[PDB]
Amino acid sequence: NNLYRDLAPITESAWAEIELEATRTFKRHIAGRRVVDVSGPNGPTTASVSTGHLLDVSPPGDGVIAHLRDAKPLVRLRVPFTVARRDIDDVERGSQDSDWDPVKDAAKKLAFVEDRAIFEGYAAASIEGIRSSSSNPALALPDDAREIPDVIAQALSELRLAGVDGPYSVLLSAETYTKVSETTAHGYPIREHINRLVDGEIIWAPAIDGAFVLSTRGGDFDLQLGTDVSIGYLSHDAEVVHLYMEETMTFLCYTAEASVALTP
Amino acid sequence: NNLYRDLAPITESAWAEIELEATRTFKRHIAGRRVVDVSGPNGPTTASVSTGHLLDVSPPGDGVIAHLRDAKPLVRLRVPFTVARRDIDDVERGSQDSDWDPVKDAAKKLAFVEDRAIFEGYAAASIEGIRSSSSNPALALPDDAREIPDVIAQALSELRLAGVDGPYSVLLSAETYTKVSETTAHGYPIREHINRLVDGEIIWAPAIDGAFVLSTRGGDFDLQLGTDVSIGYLSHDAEVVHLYMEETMTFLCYTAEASVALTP
Amino acid sequence: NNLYRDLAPITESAWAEIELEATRTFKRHIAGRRVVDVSGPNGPTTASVSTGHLLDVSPPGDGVIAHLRDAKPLVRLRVPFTVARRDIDDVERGSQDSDWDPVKDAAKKLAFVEDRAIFEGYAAASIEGIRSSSSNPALALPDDAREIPDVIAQALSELRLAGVDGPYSVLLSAETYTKVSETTAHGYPIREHINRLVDGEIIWAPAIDGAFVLSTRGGDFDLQLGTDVSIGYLSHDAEVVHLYMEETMTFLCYTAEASVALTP
């Protein structure tokens, strides 16, 4: 009800088209949710996640010991966008090529923001990313792609020597993903070697910079959602309708030695 | 299990006696829980209470609007105390007059701390009390007790003129309670007049300073408990056992004009 | 009962977390138990393993022949470690990132000790390892990884010429494992060649020095356990709890020509 979608001059079919486009774009442009554990929507009443720690505070009086409970607040991210009214009206007339580019742009922006917060951190929201939280030393991606299989093999060894078990996955930036896809060593593609090195999967991650090697055993990275991605309405005009894409979330990292970062 | 009561050299009967004494003392010395609404124990995993508000924060990037969710953290209060081992051992021998004075002192201290936090506030825990949160102007208790019925009648009128309804209750400090109990006007006790003025009850509140006139309709004052009063064990010796009384709580005031403070 | 875990100030959830971490780390860091035959726990009353041989001794008197029965005693290995009490207490408050690094370190130390005893021997315990017990001549690992497939093929031939049958497995040190994983010959990875040479499996063995080629038909290597890995409690303080990881075991090698050692 807080979305006020009933006040928007948008028909049911137009809403369905917009939602389909947004879902497709967000699914295509998101990679963090494919590795970390998602704590599903807890409702609009959720404002923070309890960590279970205690913080020393001044006692209310003599002879009393006081401790505050520690919690991490959620953050709400809102990406506004605008949709032309003629495109909405053409849907009911059988139009199959309505312009939903703003929806795609908003979905891409929200997905990139979420991925960067998960992996690179968001200081204002008190989110420490996987890269900063990792304790394993960071490796460097080689200049030539033919050496990528070696470095990924060095990281895995680290994860094995730290006691971290379970399937291992590699998240590669767009440039690194393309380089690995097209590179061959004496005619032998290097993807067929990385696929054998890694028993998990290679993930298309267009939002990160370098590469990440993580252990997907479970219980190391938790994305807490208070509210999942939702589309709402602000106002409209004789020509345009103003909507927004919204999400309330936070990220927590528990295991520091379950990730290795390969810098560019 | 976190109380570690199984490691203490205390028998079941001694535990029962200690708990009975603590419960009696805390019930006798507490007055805040008789007026405000208690949100019962939510378990050890509760660290904060969501308020439903939003705080502006710096956006993660251009074209995005960010808001943090606001929450009030809980605070844990711990009052340690010590019990002699001979008194514990005498319980199994049929002793009916074991020394539980430390338990009573700890219970009184915890109850007074909780009452003062509810009514006078606790800045370090971000708790704003009923007195500071109230918007109605504060009245002054008269020098002579015979005029107390008039001032209480002035406060009620205020509560009526602000639109606040429901039963009205008066919390009186120990000195004011005794003065009202013993005072008479031309032989007519003033308690029989205050009882007719007030359709709720007169509450013995030995922790507050002056007096409070509140509306007990409901939904104005909320004491959130993460964990109720519990007794735990720290360590022991050949002569003494070290225990503590613990409670995790916070207080929230919603209706500012549902209370009037009568200063001493 | 001899572990005295009931005296420890540790809750059930903390015990579960500690045991889970220890099991994960030990499973990740152990390789001997994946090849040899494990004679399961026989109970605390087991003190030695009978070999079935006889030792000449001085007769008690004229006209009598005396022989002592030969047995190999078990050895108990204990690795103490310490855990902070605040981390234990945070588990009941919903903490998901408690510090169990000491448990991981103890598990790694115990696993490495057991692996080195199985493969390199432990003279004080009268344990002769696989390397010293082997009768086949030891080969040398080549300087360049591209020649590793050849040497492993030389060892297998030896095992075939000695009459040893059954699946063959290769245990590689961490360095050799990584080298084999990353090395390629004219773009063709050498793992795809070693996997075809060997009909068993390639085992990650971070405790051994060079490499081992063994026959896993069965009945050649026996790890006798009197008591499996178990966690016990020694004492505690106001800040820390002292625990230990314990195991009673011995190792026996029967077939001398069922193993080949490739030195670094």
Numbering used by the authors:
A (entry chain TA), B (entry chain A), C (entry chain WA): 2 to 265
From the paper:
An alternative, promising approach involves protein capsids, such as encapsulins, which can be viewed as genetically encoded enzyme encapsulation, and is particularly suitable for immobilization or within physiological conditions. The capsids, comprised of 60–240 subunits arranged in an icosahedral structure, engage with a conserved C-terminal encapsulin localization sequence (ELS), or a more extended N-terminal encapsulation-mediating domain, found on the guest protein. Our study showcases the encapsulation of the nitroreductase NfsB, which we produced as a fused dimer, within encapsulins.
Cryogenic electron microscopy reveals the overall architecture of the encapsulated dimeric NfsB within the nanoreactor environment and identifies multiple pore states in the shell. The crystal and cryo-EM structures of encapsulins from close homologs, have multiple openings in their capsid shells, including a threefold pore and an five-fold pore. These openings are thought to be the channels for the substrates and/or products of the cargo protein. The cryo-EM map in this area was ambiguous however and appears to be the superimposition of flexible states. To resolve this, the pentameric subunit was examined by 3-D classification and resulting volumes were refined using local refinement without symmetry constraints. This isolation a series of volumes that could be categorized as open, closed or uninterpretable. The open and closed particles were pooled and refined to yield complete, unambiguous maps (ESI†). The closed pore inner circle diameter in this structure was 4.62 Å. The primary drive of this is a shift in the pore forming loop (measuring 3.84 Å between the displaced His188 alpha carbon, see attached movies M1 and M2). The underlying cause of this movement is unclear and may represent an equilibrium of states when resting at cellular pH or could be a result of different packing states within the particles stacks.
